[PDB]
Enzyme design. Structure first.
Site, PDB file in Angstrom:
ATOM      1  N   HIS A   1     -21.149 -31.783 -28.483  1.00 56.85           N
ATOM      2  CA  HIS A   1     -20.138 -32.047 -29.647  1.00 56.85           C
ATOM      3  C   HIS A   1     -21.230 -31.376 -31.223  1.00 56.85           C
ATOM      4  O   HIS A   1     -20.914 -32.108 -32.320  1.00 56.85           O
ATOM      5  CB  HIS A   1     -20.448 -33.617 -29.595  1.00 56.85           C
ATOM      6  CG  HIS A   1     -19.295 -34.296 -28.153  1.00 56.85           C
ATOM      7  ND1 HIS A   1     -19.498 -33.924 -26.507  1.00 56.85           N
ATOM      8  CD2 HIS A   1     -17.951 -34.464 -28.413  1.00 56.85           C
ATOM      9  CE1 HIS A   1     -18.893 -34.501 -26.373  1.00 56.85           C
ATOM     10  NE2 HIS A   1     -18.249 -34.597 -26.988  1.00 56.85           N
TER      11      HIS A   1
ATOM     12  N   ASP B   1     -10.979 -29.719 -27.431  1.00 54.58           N
ATOM     13  CA  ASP B   1     -11.290 -29.480 -26.251  1.00 54.58           C
ATOM     14  C   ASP B   1     -12.435 -28.400 -25.735  1.00 54.58           C
ATOM     15  O   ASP B   1     -12.472 -27.215 -25.665  1.00 54.58           O
ATOM     16  CB  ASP B   1     -10.119 -29.456 -24.695  1.00 54.58           C
ATOM     17  CG  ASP B   1     -10.374 -30.466 -23.659  1.00 54.58           C
ATOM     18  OD1 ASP B   1     -11.809 -30.954 -24.158  1.00 54.58           O
ATOM     19  OD2 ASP B   1      -9.701 -29.953 -22.535  1.00 54.58           O
TER      20      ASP B   1
ATOM     21  N   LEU C   1      -6.648 -30.596 -49.250  1.00 54.54           N
ATOM     22  CA  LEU C   1      -6.627 -30.363 -47.399  1.00 54.54           C
ATOM     23  C   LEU C   1      -6.484 -31.879 -46.887  1.00 54.54           C
ATOM     24  O   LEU C   1      -7.287 -32.776 -48.345  1.00 54.54           O
ATOM     25  CB  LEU C   1      -7.592 -29.563 -46.584  1.00 54.54           C
ATOM     26  CG  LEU C   1      -7.481 -29.897 -44.746  1.00 54.54           C
ATOM     27  CD1 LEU C   1      -6.157 -29.352 -44.760  1.00 54.54           C
ATOM     28  CD2 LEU C   1      -8.325 -29.910 -44.138  1.00 54.54           C
TER      29      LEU C   1
END
Ligand SMILES: O=C(Nc1cccc(Oc2ccc(C(=O)O)c(C(=O)O)c2)c1)c1ccc(-c2ccccc2)cc1
Ligand SMILES: O=C(Nc1cccc(Oc2ccc(C(=O)O)c(C(=O)O)c2)c1)c1ccc(-c2ccccc2)cc1
Lengths: 200, 211
Positions: free
Chosen positions: A27, A10, A99
């Site tokens: 972004h 956020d 991952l």
């Protein structure tokens, strides 16, 4: 011993408008902070990173090349071509052993639970399973990421102190860490700090 | 402007340890702080208060509260509810629970919800099982099962949504308290130990929620 971290990313838009720059500018820096946080996780033996963002097609080759398994959690049932491109990135990276990265797309914790209700709600309407038999361990096998390590730690940037219908079932025993730092600013040291909170 | 507050009450034992006193002293002190949080909430326009003790490592001996506090709460117009898996319990104190609820169900002041072996996962499983019968009974197309609907079968569906969750005592976890219901709730963590959590701490939390 932190294995699974989830992040509500956020402050993308806030960060940008503070610099007098548009919604997307944030972004792009937000996508750079994503990567930053992905190497960090891979390099510190985190097994699973789940990201909630509250196009990826340009990250895929790069993630593949970094041994990352890519999985999309959420309601994608999206125009037909895109759905097939999502499957293709999943399949591409399915054999990777580093991952595991889960990206939330049109995901909701309540939706997640629902979906799982219905997988059982017709495991019953085909006389396959008793109401009585329905238990936690079962319903858990039907929610997103049941195959992965249980979520240990949830991070939210941007200063708000709520889950906002991110994971609900999965976070029953997670540590919850809220920092005012905006996502584009959230770095290795921010990330370590959350990891130390867990550790104590 | 906050209608429903849920509180994870933790730090009773640490509170006593701090002074070189056994756990039991903290529990007595926490009992007092609960009374204080119940008045505050009744007199500050809160509609519903939901209380979850938290061990982890005597808890039962919330029987003590049931037997000693119920008639007083009734006089003060408090509507008492017990949420949690009580089917587990002995018949006779299952009746006490049922009779305390029946006594107070028509009260129109604060609704007080007391979590007794509650788990947020259990809540969801319970809601589901109800639905899974409604399926094996005709009635219900699994096509039909959505969020609005499961919601109607989880604890406290007939009350305002949980707006604010408070957890005292230092830890930053839900510890399997409300889950479905805290989807949009504000989460407020303070290091004050429960026995010390007074009106001014509760006010702080409410003022924090308001922005
Ligand atoms: O149980 C309630 N409060 C309470 C207080 C203090 C301790 C405590 O349990 C603990 C906590 C920590 C520890 C530790 O070790 O940290 C231990 C331990 O291990 O012994 C035990 C629980 C309660 C009971 C009834 C109502 C109620 C019921 C009916 C009607 C109205 C109200 C409201 C709250
Ligand atoms: O909440 C408890 N008691 C209690 C009783 C009566 C009223 C009341 O709150 C109100 C409500 C409205 C008003 C109003 O309308 O003004 C007022 C007011 O006038 O101050 C007060 C609270 C309690 C619960 C559990 C334990 C416990 C926990 C663990 C072990 C043993 C005991 C101890 C006390």
């Amino acid at each position: 011993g932190c294995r699974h971290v989830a992040i509500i990313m956020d402050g993308n838009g806030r960060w940008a408008k503070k610099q007098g720059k548009i919604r997307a500018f944030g972004h792009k820096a937000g996508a750079k902070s994503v990567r930053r946080a992905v190497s960090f996780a891979a390099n510190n033996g985190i097994e699973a990173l789940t990201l909630y963002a509250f196009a990826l097609d340009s990250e895929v080759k790069s993630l593949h090349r970094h041994n990352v398994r890519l999985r999309i959690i959420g309601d994608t049932s999206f125009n037909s071509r895109l759905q097939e491109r999502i499957r293709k990135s999943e399949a591409l990276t399915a054999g990777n052993t580093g991952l595991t990265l889960n990206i939330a797309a049109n995901y909701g914790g309540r939706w997640d639970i629902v979906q799982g209700v219905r997988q059982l709600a017709e495991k019953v309407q085909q006389g396959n399973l008793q109401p009585d038999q329905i238990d936690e361990e079962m319903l858990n096998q039907h929610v997103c990421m049941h195959e992965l390590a249980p979520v240990d730690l949830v991070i939210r940037t941007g200063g708000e102190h709520r889950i906002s219908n991110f994971l609900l079932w999965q976070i029953a025993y997670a540590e919850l860490y809220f920092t005012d730092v905006l996502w584009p600013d959230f770095d290795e040291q921010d990330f370590e700090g959350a990891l130390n909170a867990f550790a104590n």
